Structure formats: structure tokens, C-alpha cells
Amino acid sequence: PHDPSFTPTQLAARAAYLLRGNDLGTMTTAAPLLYPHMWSWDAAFVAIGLAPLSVERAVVELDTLLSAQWRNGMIPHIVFANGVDGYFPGPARWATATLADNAPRNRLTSGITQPPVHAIAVQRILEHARTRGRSTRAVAEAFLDRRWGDLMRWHRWLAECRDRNERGRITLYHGWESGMANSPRWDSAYANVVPGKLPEYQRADNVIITDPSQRPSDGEYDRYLWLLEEMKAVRYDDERLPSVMSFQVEDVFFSAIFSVACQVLAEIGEDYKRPHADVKDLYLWAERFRAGVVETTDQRTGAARDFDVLAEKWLVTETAAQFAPLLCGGLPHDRERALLKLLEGPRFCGHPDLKYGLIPSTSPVSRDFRPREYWRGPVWPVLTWLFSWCFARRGWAERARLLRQEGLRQASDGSFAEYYEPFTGEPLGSMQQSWTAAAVLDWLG
Amino acid sequence: PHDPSFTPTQLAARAAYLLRGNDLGTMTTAAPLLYPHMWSWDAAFVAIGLAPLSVERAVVELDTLLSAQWRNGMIPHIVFANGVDGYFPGPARWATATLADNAPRNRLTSGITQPPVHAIAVQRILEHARTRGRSTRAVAEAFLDRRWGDLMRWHRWLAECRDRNERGRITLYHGWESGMANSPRWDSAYANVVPGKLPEYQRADNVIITDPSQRPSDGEYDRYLWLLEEMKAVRYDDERLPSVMSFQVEDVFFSAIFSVACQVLAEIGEDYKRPHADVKDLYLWAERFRAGVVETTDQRTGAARDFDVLAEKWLVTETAAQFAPLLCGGLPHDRERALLKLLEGPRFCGHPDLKYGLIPSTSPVSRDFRPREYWRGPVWPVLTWLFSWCFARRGWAERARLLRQEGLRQASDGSFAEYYEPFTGEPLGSMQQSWTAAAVLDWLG
Amino acid sequence: PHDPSFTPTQLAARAAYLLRGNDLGTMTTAAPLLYPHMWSWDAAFVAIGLAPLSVERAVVELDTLLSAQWRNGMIPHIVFANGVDGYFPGPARWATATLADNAPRNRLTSGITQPPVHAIAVQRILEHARTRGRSTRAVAEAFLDRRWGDLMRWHRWLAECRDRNERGRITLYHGWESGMANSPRWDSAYANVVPGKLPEYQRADNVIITDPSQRPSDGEYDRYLWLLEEMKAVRYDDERLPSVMSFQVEDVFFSAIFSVACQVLAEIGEDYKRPHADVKDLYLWAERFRAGVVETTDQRTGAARDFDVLAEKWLVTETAAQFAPLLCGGLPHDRERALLKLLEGPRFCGHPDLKYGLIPSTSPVSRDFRPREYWRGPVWPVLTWLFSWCFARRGWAERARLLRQEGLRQASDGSFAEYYEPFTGEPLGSMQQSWTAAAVLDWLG
Amino acid sequence: PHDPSFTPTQLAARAAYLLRGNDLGTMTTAAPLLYPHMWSWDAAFVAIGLAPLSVERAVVELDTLLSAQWRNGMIPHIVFANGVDGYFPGPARWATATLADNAPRNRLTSGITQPPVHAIAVQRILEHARTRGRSTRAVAEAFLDRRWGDLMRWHRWLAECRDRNERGRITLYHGWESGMANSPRWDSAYANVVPGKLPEYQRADNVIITDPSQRPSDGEYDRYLWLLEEMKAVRYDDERLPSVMSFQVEDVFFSAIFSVACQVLAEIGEDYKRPHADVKDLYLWAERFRAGVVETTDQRTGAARDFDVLAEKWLVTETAAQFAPLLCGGLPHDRERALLKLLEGPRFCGHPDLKYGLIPSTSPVSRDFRPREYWRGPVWPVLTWLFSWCFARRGWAERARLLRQEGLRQASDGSFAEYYEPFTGEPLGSMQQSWTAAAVLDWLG
């Protein structure tokens, strides 16, 4: 009654209870109903959440994801559960099994990608395994033996096929590949996507989340689904997409995560005596994408910009993605101090009306801000976790600690919500969201 | 490496992870492999462990158990999982579905009972639900509406059919009904059980636990299975068992739990406006069994004795069951002080070689003590929990706290072992034992 | 910032820092400025708070108090610090050094008493000492050897000199002896106190606490100080007080504390082989004062009434002292259930406007309620602690737990306030109050 | 009992109780008896430990130290408490009041310096203050206004007067200035110190710590005290010390601490708009002393060497000071990996006989190792803390976490020992050492 929050032990227990409850056997759904399949970057965070519970099962989560890797190295953003419906677009709509030459056999997947947080999950698994003794280390090391090549092929596909011009930024062909479907970042690029005759469909997502203020609009879904038509028309061929896609953007946040992931995987490579050529390529990509991210930045504030490849235009918006350079490093000293002032100030974590000192997905002072509407404003625990972990890696121990503390305070209601209203703290999106439980589990230690 | 123990949050998370992992859907197995079905008093403890995680699912656990209640009110000690093998004796051996007129329809069960800890689980569910607000209170109250009569019929069957002579002690027809299969308590009664021609069988339990030092002997299993033959021969008829059973003992520990359970259920009855006649009967039974327990006690030490009904003999052994009167109250002041001195002294919790200050199942100084052998010596987390909870209810806050603290220290290895070696702390029995995880979850709060 | 509360470790650290900061050497002040001397029941709580930090120093605190015990057994409510000013009435006003035949030599004290919580502090010291090993047990046991007789003389003085008619209730000659100066309990007795020629004085308390809404009025202080004149006029002679005092009340809360303290001290005496005649007397007094408390109770609600000895009338008020019978036991079952319903319902802990689920000193629905005014409404951490500890000793583990949880939530601001505003949680009275820090330290474990 | 360790809250409480117990008013002694005055780098750590308890009192600690700063900027290593005896050499032996032109007025101090950890304490005070709201921020900011210039003069004195040749390393004229009196680092330099006519003296330190195995030898003390005679003979004149001192070493650990402290203080200066010329000088010194540390390093292992200025030779020893480059950064990637391998391997934290995974002051495999003898082997909580904090600032979050976890495990006995036996965990040196309590308080959060 007086305090509906849970203690740290109750919260850790409920988080673990949730993760096991979303386990289908060898894959964990991203949420019970809204996302009843395996999503790529959710699966990485699920592996992080499972590592304190079972290193073996955390490795299983990544093995399942990597078993769905495309022939060319791409990790698709959905690995569909066998016989499960209730998410749209589902496998019939993607038609990758029939159309895509590089699609896996004996797995059904989507035909687009998602950010490469996977190396970070591998590091957390290895860190847990090393505290657990010989048998558990052997599990994690056997996973490295079995999957190091697949991880390399994933990073190599990103570096070679989504950065064809060696600019150090990743090109996306769908806003879904950013992880942030309706971010204001993509609005001006989506405005130039004009659907042709689009085959009939009915959304599933807003049958589960019925409050229209919390999900994208019908007109946005028409553009999301039209881009699918464009990809299917060229049978998901990498070489043909640049010629046909109505949406081609360089995603600076994805690019910064890739830089970090390359550096992380390179250090794993050195510690576990992987091939020197692989380690050298990883360090090369880490520096290439760090530089690519820095090249986008405002010289006064450090804020990173996305780039619309079709319009040949920097995309200037006020979202959390602006803070990409903080994740990967590389900014000059003065510019990074300015970027931190922006982060901590009244446009983001310093905004006087926020319930928690956390990073809203869109600045509350932006014209684009909508406090309930998915990536247009709400506070996302997954981002809080990713920022806190990257900040700790930068050496910003107190900044990381504060994000963790506020994230745990927000999460102490036990809803494990997908995102939270930034002013009232109301849980929004799906409840029982796996990567929110995973963030809590990793934080609580 | 240096410290393989888990933090309170890691331990709570792993305990919850385990409980959900043993969940078959509407019943939780007592262990993954050794006990791959629902056991009656394990199910009560599972409900206690689930209450901090999901009041709804805790209620489901008790609903499933009570759906298997016999027509006469008996709660059987096993509710078998549909299609699951691997425990022996299984349903084919009991043959209750074919033979027992009072057996449930559409559930397969054993033909014997187990201690009535269920009311304690109901109290813990209600206590959790009241901290969680209106909707959760409604779940727990709807369970009371739906199951109060079944709980009454359970207590009434114990009081009327297993205490036919109104002595205030429960008669058992199998040592398995005590929850303590090979306790030294039953050795002299088992010595008078002479098997006839016993149908061939092969144990399953020692295929899973292969160390022979940790389980009962083949000769003990022959007697356990012969008693089954005696019960089947009279088709599990309550009225016929006293005439045919080679094993008839009054179990003072079971009797003390019943007294406590009656008092607990009576208080629930008063708080939730149940029928006055039911509450009055519960208080009557609570006092009858408190007196029955006290009547067994040594006048100098307070230690409670079991009674062999066939031999007409008090059973004097040195096991944790001696402390029955501490659970239910009723001893004169001087005698209870003596009993506490026995508990805290060098024969039990004070023994100088114990790794933890916990109650061994058999006194280490007894000729009967075997440090690995099931109920002949090891320390059982389930007993630690039951003693700590009953002690707190007596008002012995520090004694309860110390048992909890030592139990948590012992459990901090994360094996969730069925029992522990009292000197080395080695985990024994089944790992991943559900009621050990439940004790940890309840303790950690 | 977004949440100014302290973590448990920060709170425990700050509580201990405070207690050591208030240590003058061999006595701890009750607060830094408002109460810059040793008060008797504060000193008991200080000893409880010191026990987790230093058993030696906890023992010193009680040794210092008992060194000021009067020749007849009375423990006076203030032991003044040598050469310290800033509290009024000071030693000159009491004039016990010169007037009181029973006052101690080479300590300056007041001339009235306070509740006998001291045995509870001895129990907590012994419980800590027993967890700390041999040298620490030796310290606590030596304190018992040295002070058991003084503790007996304290209890004997209460039983013989403040319960002259063996009614099982303690008579007070000053409202200050209740520990609750301006409780509504005493208003009708104080209305019959008419000061004669009262020597001029200036208050000190409201120089420190200047907000007039938080302290008693000048008119009340005139009565407090006039009662001192009546005592001085008979030189504090126990035999003459009944003939001259304008204020003579039986305090049912003090009486219930005394019942509990006698039972606690008797159990200590048994455990440490103290003289049997002493233990027998303690148990006799425990039951006499239990019965005396029960005799006062409302036949419907169980609520305990104080008694005005001069007016020969029961004093019916709506304060926390009504709950005296819950501390010591003795109510018939049905009436204790009614009393608990009153405690947990909308007149006390269930009042809908309370910030915390805690017991206000006066019911918010009473015409006497004043949310800021000392004992006329505020929530006192010292009472939360006493009720929680007594409730645990009754066996009401969950009720005790809930009081401790809410008390720790309230105290997490780190002000260690004397009392708190019941609706807003505003800290009131002296900050850095020693017994509030002691409560927190005992709770946090 | 079965486990004498304290819970986190009990430990935090006892640490704070200790720190307040060692408070003389405006300075905290480094220990109760062994070190009954203010030491300079202890005072910095005391301020860190006080910051979670009282930002005001933490600031006072540094104000008291800086009030004893010499005219030339030097912070002396002892500020003597007025009229306190029991440490030798005391103020009479140093004779700085009468001989040293730069000694402060109305403070008594020693005549040598100690490592510049002070900026790290300022950062922790500011970080706490920023979580506590406006009044507390005002206190910390006022301290910066009042003392920024003194902090600059301290850093300037080190950079200009103890690095006269701009080598980026700090020259010591006494092994006591390293904070590590009897480190094997200094043995070959001390072998070239030949006392002349040394005035008679009696040690005080080994009257308190009487076990000869835990303190330096008489022969070492003769050399410590003779160096004082050489300084007094030139009246502590900075310009004359190079011409007369028999001990002149470049201390690479002190140098690395100075690099870190300059970087930390420069960031503070930027954040609080201090003069730009000061910030520029601080960053210049941070990089100069980083480079100076790196220049000393082994080309295979990265291990840092001290330099004997008189012998013009690198000092190669196997102590924790080898790890200086991990604190300040600057090693090439491959050599820093080698240095981390040395730290985590069998010569240091991975030695198989260590009770805790912590850094011994001297390698257990070195011929110089002595497991009880002050800096010749014991594990020092102060160094665990410094390494953990510096490692977190490098971004090595898991390495920092592991040091803190093991440090808290070691400290959970509550002795707050000066140092610990590396194999048995036996507390050694002074108990109730202030900077050990400070480490614990900072860690527990």
C-alpha cells in the first residue's frame, strides 16, 4: 500500500522468474505477447541477464541466435519461434525462406539486421564464467571456440556490406534496423518513402498494446511494410538494395555500438589467443567506426548526427542517439565536455520535470517529444543499461553508478516495463520485457 | 575462486530461476530428476517460495495439490505428473486409481499422506498478498473462498481418521508419511515389518543418487514396498488399515505441525469470516494435538517421543523430531527451558564439529548418526526453515534469526541441495531441490 | 536530487556516526543541544544502538546510568553532564543534591523517574555479545555480575514504592515520568494542577526548537515546573508524595513496559543463574502488572486506560498508550483481536492520510490531534521500535516486520529526527536524536 | 561463533563509529595510539571516508591539513596534535618550528612530504556533495573557492621543487615520503645511508606494536632518524637538500599518483571554472609525470622501476609499486597487457596461497617477501582501495569490482587493520586504522 516497490532481493528474484518464464527452451521471447519470438539485440541482453543465473543457458541463447545467421554473416533481427504467431510482420510477410538466397536452413528469420551488441554479451558471459571456476570457464571457452568465426563473419558483414564506401558508419535500409522504430531521427527520411500498392495487412502490435499513444501510427506502419516490399522485390540481395531502397540512412548510434563491439571482441580475441588477423581487423574496424561517428558531430556541442544517404543530408534531431560518441570515444576533449553538458543538462537528464535522472529517448524540450510514444520520448531501461555499461568502460564510474541507481529506482516497481513515462514513471509498452529484466539482473549483482 | 558463494541478490535470483525451471505448468516438481512429480509438503513450501514472485502462481500450486485430494479429505503425498516416469514406486505400483474408492478422478496419486504444512503456506500467501494491494488480495481471498472447505476436510480427516481414539497424535501407516523415510525414529518399528513374497522391483532413486551412503538401503526399500502391498490388499480402506498394517506409529512431529497448522488456519478463519463451527473445530484440534505432543515428552528434558502403536512402546531416539513441542507450545516453563538447552547444546546445534549452527536431522553423538545418509544425520534446509518460522511465531525472534542467518550461509553455495553434510557442508541428496530454493526465497525477503 | 534518501549502509554508517558524536565519554546525550545530558530511557535505547558497535561501550552507558541510581532504587530520568548547561530545569532547579536524602553522591540528577526499558537493553546487549565470542561474552556477563542487584533494586522500587497498593499499575507524580510530556493522556490531570507562587524561570527548550507548534506551551511548562516545587517541599520523600502531589496518575503504558521488562529480566536471571528469589519476584511482578494493565481495558476494543488517582477516574484518550496490552499480553483472545483492529485501522496505522504505515502518538481523528506538537500526534521512531520489538516477542513476526520496514523508510532521510509529521513526513523536534539513530542501528542489523 | 564476520550494514556502522572515535575535533588521527596525529595521505583517505557521513566534516579535515601547508607549497606528512605524545619522532625531534623558514605558524608539523592523493579526496567530496542538494553543494564549492590556490601551490611545489630537472618523476629525500617506510624498494638506497653521530632516542612505535615481526628494525630506524639530522643541518632548505642528503630516490608510484591527481584536479578546475592557466599547468604535469612513469618501465613486463639518483641506477624490486603505470596510463597496449598479466598472475594476486585475491605489498615469491613485516609483504586495504579506484577510472570496471569485493571480504572481520597477513588473513599493524575504515565506507556505498 504505502510503498509498492520491491527490495533488491525481491526484484532480482522476480527478474530471474520472468526470464525463465519467457524461455521457450533454447530461445527467450523479447516479451510474453507483444514480441513472442527472439529479437537479435534483445537476445544479447537476455544472455547478459542469464549469465549470473546459468552460464550454460546464456551461451545457449547466443548459440540459438547464431544458428540463424545468414550465409553472408548477417544476424537477422528476428528469429521466429516455430509455430508461433501473434507478431506482424511474421515469416509469411518477410518470405525470406523462399526468396533470400542467404537465409538459414531450418530457421525462420526476418530479412533485416539490428545493432551488434552481441560482443558485449560475450564479455559479460566471460566475466561471470571466470568468477565461477573451471567447469564454467570451460563452457564459455568452448562457446568461443565454436562461435568466434561466426562473430567475426557478423562484424565483417557489417564492415564490408553496410559500410561499402569505408566511411565508418553503418547504412540501414529500414528504421527497424536501428532498434528505434519511430525515433524522430528517421522522420525526414520516412517522409520520402511513398508506398506503392501495398498488400493488405492488419497490425498485431496494437491489439496487444491498445493505447494508441504508446505505439507508432498506421501511416508509419504503411511505410515500414512498404520497405519490406522493396527488399522482397530484389530478393534481399545486398548488391541490389542500394539501387532500389527508398530509405538509406547511416545510423550513428548503431555505428558507435559497432565500434565498441569491435574493440570488445578484439580484447577477447587477444585474451583467448584468437587469430592475429582477426584481432587486427577488429581493432581496425573499431577505429574506423569511432572516426566515422566523430565525423558526424557538431563542432560546438559534440552531438552526433545521422545521415540520409538518399537526400545527402545530415539529420539533425534531439534524441538520445546524439550521445553516440560517448559510447565509443574519439571526441576531442573540449567537444566531449560539451556533449556531457548536453547530456546532464536541462534538455536531457537535467530536465526539471523528470521523475528519475535518466536519459529520455527524445529530449522533452524537442518539438518532436511525445511522452508516451515508443521512441519519441519515453525512458528505456535498455538504453539506461547500455549507457551505464559504456560509461563505466570510459572510466566515468560515478556517471555510470548514477544511471544504474536511477534505473534500479525506476525498475523497482517490478513491472519490467519496456519503457517508462519520463515525468510520471508510469510503465508503458509491454510489461515483462526481457531486456528490462536482464538490465536489472546485471545491475543488482 | 577465492569465494564461490553468491550475494543475496544473486542467490534470490538463482532460487527463483530454479523454481520456475521446475514448473511443469500447474505443478512444480520437488526436484528435477530424483522427485519429478508434485510432493504434498514440498508443494506447500513451493507455494511459500512462489508467493514473493507471483501470488497467482502460488495459489495455482495449492489448487493443483487440492484438486488431487481424496474423497475422504486425505491429501496424498504424491500427485504424479501426467506421462512422467523415473520415480519408483510410481502410479502402477500404488494402483490407487484402480483399487482406492476414495482416490481422485483425473489425477494419479500415491495412497499415503504427509504432514499438514499447507495452512502455513496459506498464511504466507495471505501475508504477501496484503502487501501487494487490491487485485492481489482478491486473488488470495478468492482462493480462500474456493478452498477453505477442502482445507477443513483435510484437517478433519487427519483429526478423525488418523486420531481415531482422540489421543491428539497422528497415526502413520508408513514411514514415508512422516516426510523422513529412514529416520532412526522408525527403526524399531520397521524391524517388526517382515516382508512376505514381495513383487519384483528395481529402485529408481539410486540410479539418480548413486552414492549409496546418501540414500536408504535395499533392505529398507523392501520394507517400504511391503507396506504398500499391505495397503493395496485392503484397497486403501481407512477402516481396514488398523487391522492389517505391520507399521502403526504415532508421529509426534507430524502431530505438532498439525497443532500449529490448526491454530494458523483458525486465525485465518477468524480474519476472513469463515464459519464459526470451523474455527471452533480448528481451535479444538490445535489444543488437542498440542496436548497430545506434550504427553509424549520426557519430564526432565522435554524431548518428545514417537509411539509404536503395535508394540505399545514409546520410541526413544535422538533426532530433530524430539523438538516437536517447541513448534506447537504447551510445555511447562521449566521443561521447555530444558528442551531448548538440549537444542542449543552439544548434542544438536552446539556440537563443536558442525560447520553451521543448524539442527542436524539426527544428533551427531547418537549411535544412529550417519553424516551423509538422508535423515540419519544431515542438515536439511526445509527443517531449518520450518523451525525458524515456528520459533518466530513463539516470539523467539533471536533464535529464529540465527537459524535463518546460518541457513542462508549454508545455502549461499547456490546448489539448493536437498540436505548438507553437517561437518563439511558438502551438498548432498538432489541438487536443485525446490523446497530449499523456496526456503531461501522466503528468507531473503 | 531526485531522491534524497540514504542506502541501508549509508544510513547505518550515519546513525553510528551520530551516536559516537553524541558521546561525552561515558554517557551519550539524548540529542546534541536540546537534551545535552543523559536521559534514562534514552540511555537504554542508546545502549541498544551501541550493542552492534561495541558491547563494551554499550555496557558503559548502562553502568553510567546505574551509577546515578538513588539509594532507594529509583533510576532518575536525567543524569546531568558535569558543567553542561542549556537544558531547563537544570540541577539547581531540581535541588536534589541538597534536598533528596536518597540522591546519589557525585552525580547530579533529576528527582523523578522514567519507564523501565532498561532490561530490554540488557537483553539486546547479551544477544549481541553471544554472537561475538568469548571475550565479548565475558564483558556482558561481568556487567550482569556487577549490576544485577542494581537492576533488581530498580524493579523493586517501582513495584514497592510506585505500586503501594499492589494494583499492578505504576503511579506517576509527574507527566515527565511517562516519557510523554504533553500527551493528551495527562490533560485532565494537569487541569487540576494549580501553581502557587512559582519561582521565575525562562525556558531553554524553545530557544533550541523555536517553532512554537512543535513544543509544549508556557502554561503547560508552568504546571511541569510547579510539580517540582511540590516535590522539593517534601524533599523528594517517597512517603510524603501521596499526601502533597497535585498530580498522581497510574500510567498503563509504563505499567505494560514494566511487565515486559520484569519478564525479560527474569529470563536473563534464569539464563545466568541469578538468585532464584529474584527470578521469582520478577515473574510475580510481570504477571501482577500484566493483570493491572488488563484491568484498565475497554470491554469492547481492549484499549487500555490510564487512571487519575486523585479524581478516582479512568482517563479515556485516543493515544498510542491505548495499545499497552499488546506489549505485555494478557487480554482475552477476542479483545486482543479488537485491539489489533483498532491499531491497524483508520484511527491509527490505517489512517488514509499517513505517509507511512506507522503509529501516530495521538489518533489523527481525535479532537486532541495536533500533527506537529510533540506527543499530541507526531510519529516517534522510538515508539515504532518499541512496538516492533514487543510485537516480535508476541510472535507477530509479520506485524513487527511491517513496523520496522516503514520505520526504516521514514528514517531513510538521515535526519534522525525526534519525531516526524504524520502526513508529510517532515522531520520535527531535535534532529540527530540518539534514540532514533539507535532504533535504526538495531533494525538494520 | 561459526562466522565472526559482520554484515555490510554492521561493517559500515562500525567503520563510521571508528572514524568518529578517532576525531580529535578538527583532525582525525591515523590510528588511536600508533599514529595519534594527522598524517597527510591518511587525512586524504579520512576525508573520503567522511564524505558519505558529513561533507562539512570531510571539508574540515582537508582545511586542517592545508592550514599546515608550508610557505613554499609543501604539505608535510604529519600535522601534530597539540599536546599529544606517543609518536616518535615527535615535533621536538623534527625541530621544524625553530629551523624551517617555510614551516607554518601555529601548527607543528614534520619536515618531509607524502603522496598527493588529496585531489582524489576532493573529487569524492564533490561527487557526494552533488548528490546531496544545494546547501551541501555550497559547502563543497566554498571549500574549492577557499583552497583551490593552496592545492595548486601543493602541486606546483612537487612539480617545480621535487622534479627540478623536469624528468616527470618526484625525488624523495626520505623513504617515509613514499608512504612505505620499509618497502624493499628502498633497501639498496638505505644501504648507502651511513649515520654519523646520531642523537640518542627510544622508539615509540614498537611499544604499541610489540611484535618485532610487524615493524621495521632498529637498524632501519637509525637510518630513518639520521636522514632527519641531515635535513635539520641545512634547516630544511629545498635548495640545499640535493647537496647534502644521503638518500635521493625517484619514486615511480608517488609519480604515478601525482599524474592521476593532476588530471583529477584539472578536471575539477574545468568543472568549477578555476583559472585556465592553472588547468593548463595541471594537464601539462599530468602528461609529464605519465611519461616519466612510462620511461622507467621494463620493456617486457611493463613493470615500473624506481631510480636511485645518487647511484644513478634503476631500482628493480618486486613490490606493488611496479604497477604504477596501471594507475596513470601511458603504456603501449601490449606492455600494459603484460603488466596486467603480472598483476593477476602467480607472483601477485593469483598466488595460490593467498587467502584473498588482493595485491600483496611485496610479491610472495620474492626473496624480499616477509608476510608480517609492514611493507615487505602484507596486504594493505589502503592500496586495495587506491588500485580499485584508479582501475575504475581506467575503465576496468570488473577488475575494480573484484578488488573491492575481496577487500570487503577481508575487512569483514571488523578489525579495520592497518594491513593483513596475506596467507592467513590475520589482522596486523594497528587495529582501528582510519584509512582502512575509510576504504570500507567508500566501498560499501
Residue numbers in the entry:
A (entry chain B), B (entry chain B), C (entry chain A), D (entry chain A): 2 to 446
Source paper text:
To avoid substrate hydrolysis during crystallization or soaking, three catalytically inactive variants of MhGgH were produced. The sequence variations were identified by homology to other characterized MgH enzymes and analysis of the MhGgH–Ser–GOL ternary-complex structure. Two putative catalytic residues (Asp182 and Glu419) and one substrate-interacting residue (Asp43) were identified and replaced by alanine to produce the D43A, D182A and E419A variants. The thermal stability of the D182A and E419A variants was comparable to that of wild-type MhGgH, while that of the D43A variant was slightly lowered (3°C) [Fig. 2(d)].
